[PDB]
Design a protein around this nucleic acid. Structure first.
Lengths: 65, 86, 62, 154
RNA sequence: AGACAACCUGGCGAACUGAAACAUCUUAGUAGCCAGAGGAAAAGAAAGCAAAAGCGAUUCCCGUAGUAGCGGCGAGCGAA
RNA sequence: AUCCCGUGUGAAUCAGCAAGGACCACCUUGCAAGGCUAAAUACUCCUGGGUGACCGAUAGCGAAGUAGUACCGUGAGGGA
RNA sequence: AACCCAGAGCUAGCUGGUUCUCCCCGAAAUGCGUUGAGGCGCAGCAGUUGACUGGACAUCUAGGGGUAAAGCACUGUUUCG
RNA sequence: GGCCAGUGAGACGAUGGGGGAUAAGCUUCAUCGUCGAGAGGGAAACAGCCCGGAUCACCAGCUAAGGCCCCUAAAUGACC
RNA sequence: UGGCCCUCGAGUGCAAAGGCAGAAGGGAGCUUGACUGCAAGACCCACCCGUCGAGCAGGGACGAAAGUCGGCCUUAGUGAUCCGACGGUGCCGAGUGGAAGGGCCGUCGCUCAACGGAUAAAAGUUACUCUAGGGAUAACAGGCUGAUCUUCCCCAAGAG
């Protein structure tokens, strides 16, 4: 969104593992355990990074398509 | 809100910037000197980034912690009087 | 038989040696964004100096 | 005996009020203890264990069964104990349970009413019950209880 | 009717002050105004509590916790 | 939650209903919609006896000698 | 925006006052915060009590930080040729 | 480590630096000493400057700082 | 563009100090520890709090390998408490079995800046003034000091 003194918002998303959970939260306005912050405006969309969650180690991560 | 107008700087500071321990001493694995934070690891005192001549301590204690720019980083191991029995 | 401070009892918890082991701060849900290997070093420590007035409050509650 | 109060007369002529001018009237706790000292509260605030817990420690310190009605000389522990009892009168909790401690053990013994742990199994095996750790190789299913104590029904 | 000394039931109902500010809250449902009755009133043998053990009228005293719980969970109040 | 209500409505009714601090099932207990009921419990003008390391007429109740009089204010009231 | 009584002996980190005697030791008026800075809380400083070759002055050995001074290659200035 | 404190607007002189004209016993920091919580001796009289820092008595001596014509004790002492 | 002199006098995301060409400088491939759980020994604060950190346990990336990485050259880019939303966790859950709720793990909301933040929410006058105190906080004035002001004086081109 347009940056400036008016109506701003921290572009902070999450990265949930594929068909898994843990090390991440799922709600209306919540962030993962690592608390990732995208750019939104800047060409992004579709985030993902193989991280090591609770169950086992290293997976896929990266929610919000 | 943020103020603006005719005025100079303000607010004092303090790192601080001193030296812990010194040459020839039971320098434990603490952090000698450390004028600035983010100091990398060093398994000894220090002795670099300054006039010719390396520094050395009489006793060591499993690794340590000294600045990255001044005094350091890590090179040769120094420890007068081998810490061993018999 | 004195009005024991409640808002204080629900916080500290006298260990055993009469020490007031107060949990860390800024840990509750953090509310401080990311902390990187910081929220992990948050457990339960003990207070000093001022502790000589925080324990006297709940003298009865022990 | 009498540090010197009773009034304010004598030497140095006391003047109270800390001799400065704070709160001449007692009770004026300068700087409330709550604020500035009310650090994050989380460790304390809990759900509160249902168990009444009339005694921080278990029933006692291994003293059951003894010459007298202080234990009923039958090893049961209910509410008819004097020397050693969960409460001066007894009967006001839920689960008993007990561990080892001071005392020359007990000649006679017949532990009952739950209770377990090596504390009262390997040390109190001289009579009544004993220490028996149900193995986990017999059955293919997960281990059956951490420690099972014989003679203690449920 | 006593233009009724206190205690008691009922109707109505503050502030100062405390919350080191103050409109929530607390401080007082006290003080104060008014009505009635007894010398005791009020309450009282229980669609209770506890519990699957059983107790079992109300009221009063000592404990159980001034814990639990409630509250800008702040002050403060305060169960069973 | 429950108990007592202003207002609009308002079921069942004992092989039925309520309560168990949301609700629901089971179980258990108790069943009020009308009333009476001694004692333990509170306080005191006043009565009789007695007690008190309580004071002693600038003390103590304002009043231990015909003062809450004499006086002040319109008065309430204040008050040697 | 009263008079009199009652809660209010209200509140009053304000100010003033605060009534026998001897012995020993001995403060501070600073820091960190505070709608906080003529207020205080914590810490420093004082007194008391219970444990510790724990410390201070001086000599020697063993380092660094780099003021004064000086310099002024570099940064920012500077006259004559 | 534990119990009870007190005090947070201090002042001045020397020294090393910011403010002001390097003007102020002015103001704001650091350091030492004094006053402030210790007199007295000396600067005529000036707490903070100097010497010295008071358990007490004593018609007891010697000194520090400062002085030695008189006034209040002490060289119009010697040499240039 | 080529050759020569090529010496923090360049470049470091942004202020500035320090440091750096064994490069964090710059480019490219692979990747993405911008890792979880802990962590001897210490620094920084009255406290809260802040900062650094070898190694250990469970799994990966790069290189042949040794080996590095728990963010970005470092230092700011921020703010506790309480009330709450939501996931996980059979921890608990006042008759029992569940549930609601609470607890625990994880995250989010407050130019709460007067930002160690008193409220979810609050601007002015008072010459009608009143009360509690002080000149440590002003006005007249004394005093210290006194650049300015007043007076006098030095050198001296010139007017006369």
């Amino acid at each position: 969104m347009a940056k400036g003194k008016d109506v701003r918002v921290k572009v902070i998303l999450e990265c949930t593992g594929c068909v898994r959970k843990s090390v991440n939260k799922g709600s209306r306005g919540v962030s993962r355990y690592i608390t990732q912050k995208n750019r939104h405006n800047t060409p992004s969309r579709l985030e993902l990074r193989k991280f090591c969650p609770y169950c086992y180690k290293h997976t896929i991560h990266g929610e919000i398509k | 809100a943020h103020k603006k107008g005719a005025g100079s700087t303000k607010n004092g500071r303090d790192s601080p910037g001193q030296r812990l321990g010194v040459k020839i001493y039971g320098d434990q694995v603490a952090k000698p000197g450390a004028i600035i934070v983010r100091q990398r690891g060093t398994k000894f005192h220090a002795g670099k980034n300054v006039g010719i001549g390396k520094d050395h301590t009489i006793f060591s204690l499993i690794d340590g912690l000294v600045k990255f720019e001044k005094f350091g980083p890590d090179r040769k191991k120094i420890s007068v009087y081998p810490r061993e029995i018999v | 038989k004195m009005k024991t401070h409640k808002a204080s009892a629900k916080r500290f918890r006298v260990t055993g040696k009469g020490k007031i082991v107060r949990r860390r701060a800024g840990k509750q849900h953090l509310l401080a964004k990311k902390n990187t290997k910081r929220k992990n070093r948050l457990s339960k420590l003990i207070q000093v100096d001022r502790s000589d007035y925080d324990n006297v409050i709940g003298a009865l509650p022990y | 005996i009498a540090a010197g109060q009773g009034a304010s007369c004598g030497f140095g002529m006391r003047g109270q009020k800390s001799r400065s001018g704070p709160g001449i009237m007692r009770g004026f706790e300068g700087g409330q203890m709550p604020l500035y000292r009310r650090l994050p509260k989380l460790r304390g605030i809990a759900g509160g264990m249902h168990a009444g817990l009339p005694k921080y420690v278990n029933v006692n310190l291994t003293d059951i069964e003894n010459a007298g009605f202080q234990d009923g000389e039958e090893v049961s522990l209910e509410t008819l104990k004097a020397k050693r009892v969960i409460n001066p009168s007894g009967r006001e909790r839920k689960l008993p349970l007990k561990i080892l401690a001071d005392g020359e053990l007990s000649k006679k013994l017949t532990i009952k009413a739950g209770a377990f742990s090596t504390s009262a199994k390997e040390k109190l095996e001289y009579a009544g019950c004993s220490l028996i750790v149900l193995p986990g190789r017999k059955k293919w299913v997960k281990p059956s209880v951490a420690k099972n104590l014989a003679r203690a029904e449920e």
